[PDB]
CSV table of C-alpha atoms and ligand atoms in Angstrom, one decimal:
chain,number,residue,atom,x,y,z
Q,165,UNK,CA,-34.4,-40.4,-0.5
Q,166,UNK,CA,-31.0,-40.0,-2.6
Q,167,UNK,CA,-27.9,-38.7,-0.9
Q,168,UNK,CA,-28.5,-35.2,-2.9
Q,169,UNK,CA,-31.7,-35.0,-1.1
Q,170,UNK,CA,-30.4,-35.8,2.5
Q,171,UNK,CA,-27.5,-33.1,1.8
Q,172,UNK,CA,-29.4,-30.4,0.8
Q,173,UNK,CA,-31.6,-30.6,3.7
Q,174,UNK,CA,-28.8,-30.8,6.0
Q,175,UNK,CA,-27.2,-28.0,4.7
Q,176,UNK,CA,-26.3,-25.4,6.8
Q,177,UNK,CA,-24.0,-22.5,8.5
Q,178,UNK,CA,-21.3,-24.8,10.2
Q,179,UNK,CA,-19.6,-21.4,11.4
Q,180,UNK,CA,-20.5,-20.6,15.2
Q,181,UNK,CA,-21.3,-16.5,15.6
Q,182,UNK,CA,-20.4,-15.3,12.0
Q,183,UNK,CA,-21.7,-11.7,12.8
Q,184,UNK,CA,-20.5,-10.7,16.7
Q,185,UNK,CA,-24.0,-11.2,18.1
Q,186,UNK,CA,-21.8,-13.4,20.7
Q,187,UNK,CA,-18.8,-11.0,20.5
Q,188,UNK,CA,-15.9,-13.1,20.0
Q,189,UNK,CA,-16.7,-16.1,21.1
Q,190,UNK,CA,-16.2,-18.9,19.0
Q,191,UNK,CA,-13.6,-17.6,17.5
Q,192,UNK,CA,-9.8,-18.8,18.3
Q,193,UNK,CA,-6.4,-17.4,17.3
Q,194,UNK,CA,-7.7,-13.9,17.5
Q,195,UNK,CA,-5.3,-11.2,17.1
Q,196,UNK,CA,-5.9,-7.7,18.1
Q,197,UNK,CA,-3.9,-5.6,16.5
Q,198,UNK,CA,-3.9,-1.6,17.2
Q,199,UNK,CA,-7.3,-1.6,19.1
Q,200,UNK,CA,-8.2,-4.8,18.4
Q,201,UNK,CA,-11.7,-6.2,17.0
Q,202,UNK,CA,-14.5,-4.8,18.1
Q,203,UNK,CA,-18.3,-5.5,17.2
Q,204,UNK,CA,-20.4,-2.8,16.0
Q,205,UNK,CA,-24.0,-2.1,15.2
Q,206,UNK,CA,-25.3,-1.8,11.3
Q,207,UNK,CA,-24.9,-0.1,9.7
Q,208,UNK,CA,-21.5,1.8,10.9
Q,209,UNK,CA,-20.8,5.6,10.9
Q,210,UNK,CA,-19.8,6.4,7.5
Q,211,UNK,CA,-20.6,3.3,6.2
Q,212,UNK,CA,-23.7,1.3,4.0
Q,213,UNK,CA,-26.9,-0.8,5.3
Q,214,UNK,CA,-26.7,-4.4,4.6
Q,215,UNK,CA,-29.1,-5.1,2.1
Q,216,UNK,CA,-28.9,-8.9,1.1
Q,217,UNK,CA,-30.0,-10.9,4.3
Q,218,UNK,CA,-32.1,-8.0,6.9
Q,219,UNK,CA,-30.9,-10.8,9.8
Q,220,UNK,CA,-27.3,-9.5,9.9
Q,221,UNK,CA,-27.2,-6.5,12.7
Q,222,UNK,CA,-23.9,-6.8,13.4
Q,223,UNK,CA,-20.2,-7.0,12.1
Q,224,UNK,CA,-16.8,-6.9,13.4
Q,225,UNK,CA,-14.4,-4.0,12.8
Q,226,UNK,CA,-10.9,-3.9,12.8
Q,227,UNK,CA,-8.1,-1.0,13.6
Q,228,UNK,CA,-4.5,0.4,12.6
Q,229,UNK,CA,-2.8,-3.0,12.5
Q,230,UNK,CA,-3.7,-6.3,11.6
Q,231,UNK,CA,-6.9,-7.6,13.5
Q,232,UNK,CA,-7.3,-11.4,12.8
Q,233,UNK,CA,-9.4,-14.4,13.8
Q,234,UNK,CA,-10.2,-18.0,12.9
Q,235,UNK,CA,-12.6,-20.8,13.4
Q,236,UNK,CA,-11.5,-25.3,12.8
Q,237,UNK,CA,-14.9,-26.5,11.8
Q,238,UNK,CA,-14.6,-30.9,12.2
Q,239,UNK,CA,-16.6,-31.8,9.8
Q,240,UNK,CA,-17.0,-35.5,11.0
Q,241,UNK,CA,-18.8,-34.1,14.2
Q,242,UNK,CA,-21.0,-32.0,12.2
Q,243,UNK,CA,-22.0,-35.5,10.8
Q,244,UNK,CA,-20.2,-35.9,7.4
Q,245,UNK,CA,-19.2,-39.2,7.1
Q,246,UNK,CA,-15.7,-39.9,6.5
Q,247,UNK,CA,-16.2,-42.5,3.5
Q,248,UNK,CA,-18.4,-39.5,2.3
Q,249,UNK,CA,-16.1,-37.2,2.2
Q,250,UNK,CA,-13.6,-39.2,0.8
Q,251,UNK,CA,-15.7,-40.9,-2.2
Q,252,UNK,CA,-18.1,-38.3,-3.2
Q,253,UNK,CA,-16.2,-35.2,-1.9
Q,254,UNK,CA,-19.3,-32.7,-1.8
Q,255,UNK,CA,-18.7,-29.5,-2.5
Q,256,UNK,CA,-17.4,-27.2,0.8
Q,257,UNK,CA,-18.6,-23.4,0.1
Q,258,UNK,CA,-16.9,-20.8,1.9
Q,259,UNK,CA,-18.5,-16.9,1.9
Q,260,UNK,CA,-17.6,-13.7,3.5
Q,261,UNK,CA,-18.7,-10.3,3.4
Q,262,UNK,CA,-16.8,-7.2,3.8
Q,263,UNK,CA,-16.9,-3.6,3.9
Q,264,UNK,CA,-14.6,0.1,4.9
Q,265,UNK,CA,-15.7,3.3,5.7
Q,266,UNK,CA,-15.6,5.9,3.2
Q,267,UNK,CA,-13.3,8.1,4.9
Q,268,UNK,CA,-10.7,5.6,5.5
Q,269,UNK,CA,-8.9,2.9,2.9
Q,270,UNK,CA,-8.5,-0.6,4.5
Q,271,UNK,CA,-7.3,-4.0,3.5
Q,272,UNK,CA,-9.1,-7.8,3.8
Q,273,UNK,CA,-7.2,-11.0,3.8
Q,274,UNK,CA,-8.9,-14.6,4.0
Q,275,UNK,CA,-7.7,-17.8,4.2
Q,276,UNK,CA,-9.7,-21.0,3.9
Q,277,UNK,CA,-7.6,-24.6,4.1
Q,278,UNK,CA,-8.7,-28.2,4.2
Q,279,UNK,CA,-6.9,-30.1,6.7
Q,280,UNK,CA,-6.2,-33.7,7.4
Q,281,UNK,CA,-7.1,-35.7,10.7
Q,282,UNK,CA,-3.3,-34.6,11.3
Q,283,UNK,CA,-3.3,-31.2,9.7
Q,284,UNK,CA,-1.5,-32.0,6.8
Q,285,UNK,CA,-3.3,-29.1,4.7
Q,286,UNK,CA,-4.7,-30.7,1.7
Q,287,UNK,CA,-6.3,-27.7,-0.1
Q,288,UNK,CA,-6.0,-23.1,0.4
Q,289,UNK,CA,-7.4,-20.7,-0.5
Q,290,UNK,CA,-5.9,-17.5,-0.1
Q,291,UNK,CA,-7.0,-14.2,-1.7
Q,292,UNK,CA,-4.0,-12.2,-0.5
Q,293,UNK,CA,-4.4,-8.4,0.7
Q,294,UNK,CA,-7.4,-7.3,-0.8
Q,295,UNK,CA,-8.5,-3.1,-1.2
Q,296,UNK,CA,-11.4,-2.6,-0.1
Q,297,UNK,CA,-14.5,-0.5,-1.5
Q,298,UNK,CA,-13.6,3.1,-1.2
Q,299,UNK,CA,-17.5,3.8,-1.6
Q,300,UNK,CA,-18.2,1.9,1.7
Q,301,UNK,CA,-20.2,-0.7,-0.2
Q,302,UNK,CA,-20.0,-4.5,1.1
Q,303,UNK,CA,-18.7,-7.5,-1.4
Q,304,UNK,CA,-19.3,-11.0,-0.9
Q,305,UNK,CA,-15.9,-13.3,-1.4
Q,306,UNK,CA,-17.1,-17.4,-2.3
Q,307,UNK,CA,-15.1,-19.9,-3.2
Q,308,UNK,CA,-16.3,-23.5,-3.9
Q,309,UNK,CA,-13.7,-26.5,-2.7
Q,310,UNK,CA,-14.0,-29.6,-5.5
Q,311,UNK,CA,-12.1,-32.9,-6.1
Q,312,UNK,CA,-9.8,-32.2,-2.9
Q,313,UNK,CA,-9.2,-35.7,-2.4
Q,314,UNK,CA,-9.4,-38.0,0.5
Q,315,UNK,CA,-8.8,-37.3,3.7
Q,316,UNK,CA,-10.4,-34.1,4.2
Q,317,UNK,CA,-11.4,-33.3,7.9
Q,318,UNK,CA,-11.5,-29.9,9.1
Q,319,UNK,CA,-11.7,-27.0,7.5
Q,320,UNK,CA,-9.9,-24.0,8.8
Q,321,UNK,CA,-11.7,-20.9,8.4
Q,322,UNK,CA,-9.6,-17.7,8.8
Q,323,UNK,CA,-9.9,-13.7,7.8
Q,324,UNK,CA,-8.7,-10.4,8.8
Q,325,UNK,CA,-8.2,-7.0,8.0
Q,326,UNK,CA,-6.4,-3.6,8.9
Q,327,UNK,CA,-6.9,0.4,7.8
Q,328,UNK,CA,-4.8,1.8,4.8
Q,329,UNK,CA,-4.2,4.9,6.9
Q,330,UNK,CA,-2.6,3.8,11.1
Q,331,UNK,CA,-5.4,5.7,12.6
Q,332,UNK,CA,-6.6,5.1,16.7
Q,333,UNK,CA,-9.7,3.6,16.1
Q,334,UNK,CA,-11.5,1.8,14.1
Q,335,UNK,CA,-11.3,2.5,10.7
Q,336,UNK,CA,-10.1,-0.8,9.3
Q,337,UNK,CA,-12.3,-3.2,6.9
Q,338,UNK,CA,-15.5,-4.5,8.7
Q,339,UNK,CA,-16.6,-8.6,8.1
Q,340,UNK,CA,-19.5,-10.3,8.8
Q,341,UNK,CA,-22.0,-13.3,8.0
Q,342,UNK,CA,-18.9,-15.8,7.2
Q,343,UNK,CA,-20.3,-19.0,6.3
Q,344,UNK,CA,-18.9,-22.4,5.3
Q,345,UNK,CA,-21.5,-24.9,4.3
Q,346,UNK,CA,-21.0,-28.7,2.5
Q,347,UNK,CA,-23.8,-28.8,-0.2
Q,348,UNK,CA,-24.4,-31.4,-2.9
J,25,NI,NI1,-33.9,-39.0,-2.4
């Protein structure tokens, strides 16, 4: 009966589609660059099995120029009070896998903000362009959002990637089971 208890049983993936089984929907401000996006079985040609999770079947695989997409997750529909949010601040986890093929290079970006009732951005986190595994082998980014303040509302969810080499195709850096949660 404590709030810790009523969190962690509410916990959950407030992402919509984080691994293509709905192609792109869900998804706003997606940019297709080269190709564009473009959902793909597991595990890719020349690429690695996803071994961490067995319900992930698909991922999205981007081309020769930048490929990008976001999600605004309001986190007061999802049922997180306002004077929560404000007073205990909970902790807002953010994850994302990604992955290349081994005979390509490619390049990830992700960039998670907090946002305001009016956008102001309150909180970022930004990893910059990010090298992916050579050896085809997925990595899991997390970051954990603390002591943001008041006045958080949304939280803007957005990644992308590109290949290291302007190939047609699809050789750029695959992503898949995103995931932002609010846990105690
Ligand atoms: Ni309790």
């Amino acid at each position: 009966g404590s709030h810790f208890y009523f969190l962690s049983k509410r916990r959950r993936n407030l992402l919509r589609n984080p691994c293509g089984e709905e192609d792109l929907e869900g998804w706003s401000d997606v940019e297709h660059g080269g190709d564009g996006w473009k959902v793909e079985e597991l595990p890719g040609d020349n690429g690695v099995e996803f071994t961490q999770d067995d319900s992930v079947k698909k991922y999205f695989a981007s081309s020769f120029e930048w490929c990008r997409k976001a999600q605004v997750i309001d986190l007061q529909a999802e049922g997180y009070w306002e004077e929560l949010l404000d007073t205990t601040q909970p902790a807002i986890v953010v994850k994302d896998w990604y992955s290349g093929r081994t005979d390509a290079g490619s390049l990830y970006e992700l960039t998670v903000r907090l946002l305001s009732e009016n956008e102001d951005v309150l909180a970022e986190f930004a990893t910059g362009q990010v090298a992916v595994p050579e050896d085809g082998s997925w990595m899991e980014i997390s970051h954990t959002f603390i002591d943001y303040g008041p006045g958080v509302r949304f939280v803007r969810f957005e990644h992308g990637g590109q290949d290291s080499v302007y190939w047609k195709g699809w050789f750029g850096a695959r992503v898949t089971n995103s995931s932002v949660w609010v846990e105690p």
